[PDB]
Amino acid sequence: RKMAFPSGKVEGCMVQVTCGTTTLNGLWLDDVVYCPRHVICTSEDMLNPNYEDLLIRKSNHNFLVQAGNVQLRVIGHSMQNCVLKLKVDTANPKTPKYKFVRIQPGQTFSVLACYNGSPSGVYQCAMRPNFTIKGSFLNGSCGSVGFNIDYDCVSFCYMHHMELPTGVHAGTDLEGNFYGPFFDRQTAQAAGTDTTITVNVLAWLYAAVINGDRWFLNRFTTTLNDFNLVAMKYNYEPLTQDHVDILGPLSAQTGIAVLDMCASLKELLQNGMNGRTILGSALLEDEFTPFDVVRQCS
Amino acid sequence: FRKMAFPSGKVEGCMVQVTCGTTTLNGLWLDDVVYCPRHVICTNYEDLLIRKSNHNFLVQAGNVQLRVIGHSMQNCVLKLKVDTANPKTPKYKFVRIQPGQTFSVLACYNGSPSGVYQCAMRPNFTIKGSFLNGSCGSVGFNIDYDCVSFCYMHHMELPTGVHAGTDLEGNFYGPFFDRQTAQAAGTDTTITVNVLAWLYAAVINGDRWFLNRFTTTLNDFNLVAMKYNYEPLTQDHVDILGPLSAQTGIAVLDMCASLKELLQNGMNGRTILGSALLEDEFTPFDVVRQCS
Ligand SMILES: COc1cccc2[nH]c(C(=O)N[C@@H](CC(C)C)C(=O)N[C@@H](C[C@@H]3CCNC3=O)C(=O)COP(=O)(O)O)cc12
Ligand SMILES: COc1cccc2[nH]c(C(=O)N[C@@H](CC(C)C)C(=O)N[C@@H](C[C@@H]3CCNC3=O)C(=O)COP(=O)(O)O)cc12
């Protein structure tokens, strides 16, 4: 299954931020609230906002931060890239142990979809190689965050900003830097051509081997360079050393070398599946990470 | 449009670990009662329970131990009365869901929540979940205006890999029983009303390739549906699909003709919302709640 992390530690951090008639979601950690900076924007200055100039015309008392219907008094404000940081006079007592991290394409995370500071649902997302996610977001969702949880430490990696004309979604890390070549303005922007997440397909093949489905295992190997050149001819991502390293645990568990599995996938790309299934599916799955695979058997 | 689970925080605060002897599983702590699968007492259930004392039960809520001051059994569920009320108890109800309805599962191990995902109660009263050793006592639920409706407590994995469990009154969904015994489910069928709901979701999200100019009657559609092991579509289902048909301007029986064509022709390697298979685990409410 696509399995999200339990969302409770994040739910306790969700607030709403209103500037004018514009309300979006914010993230309340200790005595700072993080939210998309375009909350300060007006309907007439959003085609290309001068955020620096627009923020100079703003004061602490222009910002309405609410935990539910309880107002949190704002005592400071600053901008860091595309996020606004509102210092408030109350430390959130539900603040979990947390980190801010920037994830890489192929990595998965849970999204807590929120409207008016109230969580509405949770689901797993994979960052595509073109730095979009296939999410489920409506108006009012901006400021919803994505996260992973490791040993009760919440690593926030995504804050929601945009829906591209193709219906996929784009956002920033929690330091306000967009994933991919996008901008927080009211314009139609296009992602790069997407590719298949090779390291995740490999993890999926390891998962099939773990469960006894191993017809696709062959008697060949490859170099990583040779595989990377063939992979790109099939719209598959090239592998990095970090991808090879994160496949280590599954490689050891099955006893199938990473480069051996690469040679197995290489056959699958050049010969097709031939009406055979892998884990009961005609299509190769590329949104399970190596960690997701080990977790679903741990 | 994605499979979306309810936020799990209100349930996480209720999960505890229940231990009897060498057996441990998860329990649900609401006010001053912990609910868990009764086979936690096993190494004839009424005979085995009468032989247990309160002190045979260890209940851990995080790192604090709750003292069991009483115990009873309601069908396949054990009810352990504890000396502490759970301050995190949400407003809650116990409900028995209908086949074809969906819920969120909070998979837990050793009293610690691990993952959350959406399941449907299959027509054969199994669920297609993701549960491992130690997942017993994990619960399924829906949330409506901060009220948690608990509908499922997890008990077993069938040889086929699907899952079986009880409502919170301890009564199994399906013809299953809580013994260490291989059990087969009845023949499963596809939840027709949900497939139609999902095709409507695809149209609301700008996918229209499966639509056709044809229409069908309700009975003619049901003849083909039954031939393909789909559940019958009732007029109540047609009524429930009203909002989605109103939103999209596609009559329910028009969408039925689309589904009939899909069933007789196949998808021909094309895709709907990324799936090569017809999806039947979104209810009409699930589609409305998410698309709007
Ligand atoms: C002509 O221009 C366009 C053309 C074609 C495609 C386009 N797409 C966007 C866009 O995405 N614009 C951002 C705002 C900018 C400043 C980043 C936005 O609309 N974000 C939503 C979430 C979105 C809304 C629906 N589904 C989501 O994911 C917020 O949540 C904040 O807006 P709200 O105040 O809540 O309505 C503009 C645009
Ligand atoms: C001959 O026997 C069999 C043959 C063929 C298939 C079979 N299937 C089962 C079964 O499922 N048996 C229940 C216990 C009975 C008494 C209800 C069980 O094992 N439930 C798990 C969750 C399970 C564990 C793996 N995935 C899950 O969903 C608990 O959580 C409690 O067990 P644990 O103490 O946690 O290990 C027995 C059996």
Numbering used by the authors:
A (entry chain A): 4 to 301
B (entry chain B): 3 to 45, 53 to 301
Quote the study that presented this structure, word for word.
The main protease (Mpro) of SARS-CoV-2 is a salient enzyme that plays a vital role in viral replication and serves as a fascinating therapeutic target. Mpro is able to cleave the bio-synthesized viral polyprotein 1ab (pp1ab) at 11 specific sites to produce a variety of mature non-structural proteins necessary for viral replication and transcription. Among these, PF-07304814, also named lufotrelvir, is a highly soluble phosphate prodrug of PF-00835231 and a first in class 3CL inhibitor to treat SARS-CoV-2 infection. In the current study, we expressed six Mpro mutants (G15S, K90R, M49I, S46F, V186F, and Y54C) that have been identified in Omicron variants including the recently emerged XBB.1.16 subvariant and solved the crystal structures of PF-07304814 bound to Mpro mutants.
The prepared samples were successfully crystallized and the crystal structures of PF-07304814 in complex with these Mpro mutants were solved to 2.29-Å (G15S), 1.95-Å (S46F), 2.05-Å (M49I), 1.75-Å (Y54C), 1.97-Å (K90R), and 1.70-Å (V186F) resolution, respectively. All these complex structures are in space group P1211, which is different with that (P212121) of wild-type Mpro-PF07304814 complex. Two of these mutations (G15S and K90R) are distal to the substrate binding site of SARS-CoV-2 Mpro, while the other four mutations (M49I, S46F, V186F, and Y54C) are located in or nearby the substrate binding site. Though four other substitutions, namely S46F, M49I, Y54C, and V186F, situated nearby the binding site of PF-07304814, no significant changes were found in the orientation of PF-07304814. Similar with that in wild-type Mpro-PF-07304814 interface, a C-S covalent bond is formed between the HMK warhead of PF-07304814 and the active-site cysteine (Cys145) in Mpro mutants and a tetrahedral carbinol complex is generated. One obvious difference is that a water-mediated hydrogen bond with Thr26 can not be found in the interfaces of mutant Mpro-PF-07304814 complexes. The binding energy between wild-type Mpro and PF-07304814 is -9.2 kcal/mol. Among these, PF-07304814 shows the least binding energy with V186F Mpro, but shows the highest binding energy with M49I Mpro. The binding energy values between PF-07304814 and these Mpro mutants are − 8.9 (V186F), -7.4 (G15S), -7.4 (K90R), -6.8 (S46F), -6.6 (Y54C), and − 6.3 (M49I) kcal/mol.
